[PDB]
Amino acid sequence: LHFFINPNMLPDLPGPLVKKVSKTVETAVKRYYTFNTYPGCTDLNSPNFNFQANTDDGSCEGKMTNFSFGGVYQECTQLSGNRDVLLCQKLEQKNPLTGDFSCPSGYSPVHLLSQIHEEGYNHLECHRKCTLKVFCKTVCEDVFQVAKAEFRAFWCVASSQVPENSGLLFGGLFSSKSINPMTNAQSCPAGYFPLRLFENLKVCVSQDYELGSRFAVPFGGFFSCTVGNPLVDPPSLKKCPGGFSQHPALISDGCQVSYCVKSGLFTGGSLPPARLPPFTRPPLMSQAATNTVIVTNSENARSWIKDSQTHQWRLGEPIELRRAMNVIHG
Amino acid sequence: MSQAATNTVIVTNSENARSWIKDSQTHQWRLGEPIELRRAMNVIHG
Amino acid sequence: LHFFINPNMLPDLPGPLVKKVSKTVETAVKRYYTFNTYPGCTDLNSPNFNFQANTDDGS
Amino acid sequence: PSLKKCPGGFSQHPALISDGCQVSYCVKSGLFTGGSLPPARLPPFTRPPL
Amino acid sequence: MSQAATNTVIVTNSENARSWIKDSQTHQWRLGEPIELRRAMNVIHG
Amino acid sequence: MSQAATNTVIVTNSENARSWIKDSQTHQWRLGEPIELRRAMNVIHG
Amino acid sequence: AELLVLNYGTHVTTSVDAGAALIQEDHLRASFLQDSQSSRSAVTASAGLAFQNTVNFK
Amino acid sequence: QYIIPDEIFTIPQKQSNLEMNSEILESWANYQSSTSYSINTELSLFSKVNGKFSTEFQ
Amino acid sequence: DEVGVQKCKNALKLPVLEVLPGGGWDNLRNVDMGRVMELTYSNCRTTEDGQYIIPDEIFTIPQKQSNLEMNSEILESWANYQSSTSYSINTELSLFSKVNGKFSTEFQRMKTLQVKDQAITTRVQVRNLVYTVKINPTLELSSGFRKELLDISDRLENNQTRMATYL
Amino acid sequence: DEVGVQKCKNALKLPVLEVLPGGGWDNLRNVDMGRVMELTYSNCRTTEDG
Ligand SMILES: *[C@@H]1O[C@H](CO)[C@@H](O[C@@H]2O[C@H](CO)[C@@H](O)[C@H](O)[C@H]2NC(C)=O)[C@H](O)[C@H]1NC(C)=O
Ligand SMILES: *[C@@H]1O[C@H](CO)[C@@H](O)[C@H](O)[C@H]1NC(C)=O
């Protein structure tokens, strides 16, 4: 489609500007193929056959290595909008194994993804003024601002090779738009507590070893579009451990986070449809909205109003109610 | 007669800043301009 | 239905005000699916079979 | 906190709707379960205020 | 190719301030607006 | 009245150098010329 | 907003497929399928044979 | 052969399908609508509830 | 006066060729999209045998070719899949040549029969190619497609990258 | 007035020879390309058998 976006087809636009349009559509088409690519085992006779897989992964014989899930933790750093939202409170998660922003003694942190979160907060100011005991004026201003915050999500990996017990025996996820397949809902299984992640991920976690072993799945690792899991080489490869199956978590503003598992419940079913665009949302903008009301408290009181420089003088009414909405991009 | 006259001016100091204005309850929403200059004259008899 | 409530389809209204209309209809559609969801046991061979149930409860 | 699922073996059944929120209760009769399939609850689920 | 792109913005911070603009030698004199935003893109081959 | 008058001149010193100019937000993109000569006269009352 | 969903639904159809279809829908006892995976390909081709008899033979 | 509105384009795909077989649906959870299949199978939160109050499902 | 296709149909009294290029094409699902090129009927052009009205920017090649197989062809794996209706546009040389067509209904029906039933697939066909219908390389864009490229174009001017990526 | 091929078709009422030279030819794929020569129908010529 970007072949036909060239200076010949668009003669009423400048040269380097139709190459920005051609490059931003070439990126959108390439992003559409990437989000609909499912690598996995495609041989139906192999025991770890990945139904719902498009591309031959080249790993059809695994070794069945059980791994240790060292937990997740997420930092936050407020950038703007202090004392209004407290973004760094409902966006912060500590590791249950340490109670801290660190991995345990037998583990090591792996950085998944670092992005900026945005929320909006709201002021509302009103004052009233009267002139000559008639003609009461009330203006109601409502400002919408954007508060930003940086988050950095980390992840623990068994790098000391000698644990006593692994810890936190579950590896299934659900988003604000996804579903945990071990519950078929947006909930935890029996005796599981969620751990908050990037913006909406809640990773279900239990370290009970008796009531948690009914629902505990073999966990394989996380990887994203920028980092790979280090559970394949002994940088990284972002493939899979081997024998496990990639499954996607949510999309954090154009980047896809994926996790590996070896149930067989995650694999089968029916063939999914394609993920259609758009994969991002339009961003938040800072706004302003005013409401001026003029109230004439009396008869025998005329009023003339000229609304703008192009309007003509107009005979006024007892209640006016002007409105305005002001938006600034960025 | 005792009178009153107001002059409200809105100045947008920037591009990339749109504005919509609804002048009264009978008007429709209107795309705003960088300088507005509303005017009003209020008279009371006695 | 809220995909088609955007500033392009409604050019005679301001920008942030057609996003309030689009959000209050997205909430009404989502409320309609929630009130018609019946989790329960869907396996007909189980003794505690929930007829009149849509979603597999997993219990 | 809790799970708002069910105890297990019981069946969810809805009580009334308190202005957009749904209250549900669990029971294990078998009389509450069977019958015919209900139709959909159609909107509006609230009323205009006083 | 090596390029160049400019953006000149004129902001009138006041009413009671008129402005006339003649955009080029072929244009006629034109009554100015509070926000102007001229643009230019300059390309040189090699 | 206090006044102001500007004269911006763009001179392309070469061939093999194209230029596109968008004069205002209502204009369309226009193929540029080697000598441009924009003019502006700004008056403020009082 | 909720009366908009009563009157206009939850979705907007953006493409339709215009055509016709003739459908058979039998219900069989679940004990009849439990024989093997080779009985399945004979249950399945029997239902397609009964459907062609029903359209042709009066 | 048909008058169409101005904002609507049609694609001629004069396609006929004929099955000599059947298809077995031994559970109502994985339900195929047979007339509105592509709009029910969308990726969403409530993809398991789409079509579950249709007369053809019930 | 009278304009468009219907001026051509009244003067000539013969149908329009319903198989036209210049439209959009989703290459994952093998469905066709909105129209990217401009179709005009100003010059009342027909095919050279005089049986279809064609647009002005489109030339046709008469290759009245019939193929008949007395055999079949065996496809014992869904990886090397033949589309049978969009084969030449899926087999292009690219990075994602292995993903083209893998969400089509014709593929997803074939894959679920070789895995569920442990099966192999055969295909016999009688193909009857009548025309090759191409676009003249000096064609211009459609009215709707140009408008949506100009809206992306406006956002790149104003340094609005996230809103241009969305559009 | 009336120009082009259709002036010839109305006066003569007989088809046009659909196999014409002067087009482009990809010699690796054996497909034919866009038209390189100019095809004009000014003189209403027919084949000798008419
Ligand atoms: C339902 O199907 C079963 C097959 O699973 C039928 O049982 C067979 O019937 C034939 C016909 O007389 C007997 O020869 C077989 O011995 C039966 N059993 C098996 C295991 O094949 C059964 O008859 C059917 N139900 C009815 C009411 O006819
Ligand atoms: C566009 O805006 C981004 C926002 O930070 C800035 O980094 C960049 O330098 C801007 N570019 C131009 C050409 O104004």
Provide a concise account of the structure shown.
This is part of a larger assembly, with 10 copies of chain A. The first copy, chain A, has one helix spanning 15-34, and strands at 39-40, 55-56, 69-80, 107-131, 134-158, 173-174, 193-196, 202-205, 219-223, 245-252, 255-261, 286-295, 301-306, 314-315, 322-328. Chain A has 330 residues and is mainly beta.
Describe it.
This is part of a larger assembly, with ten copies of chain A. Chain A is mostly beta strands. The first copy, chain A, is 6% helix and 37% strand. Chain A has one helix and 15 strands; from the N terminus they run αβββββββββββββββ. In chain A, strands 3, 4, 5, 12 and 15 form a five-stranded antiparallel β-sheet that branches. A three-stranded antiparallel β-sheet of chain A has the order 6-8-7, with no helix packed on it. Chain A has a three-stranded antiparallel β-sheet with strand order 9-11-10, with no helix packed on it. In chain A, β13 and β14 form a beta hairpin. The first copy, chain A, is elongated and about 95 Å long. The two termini of chain A are 30 Å apart. Chains in contact: A-B, A-C, A-E, A-F, A-H, A-I, B-C, B-E, C-D, C-G, C-H, D-G, E-F, G-H, H-I, I-J. Chains A and I meet through α1 and β2 of A and α3, α4 and α5 of I.
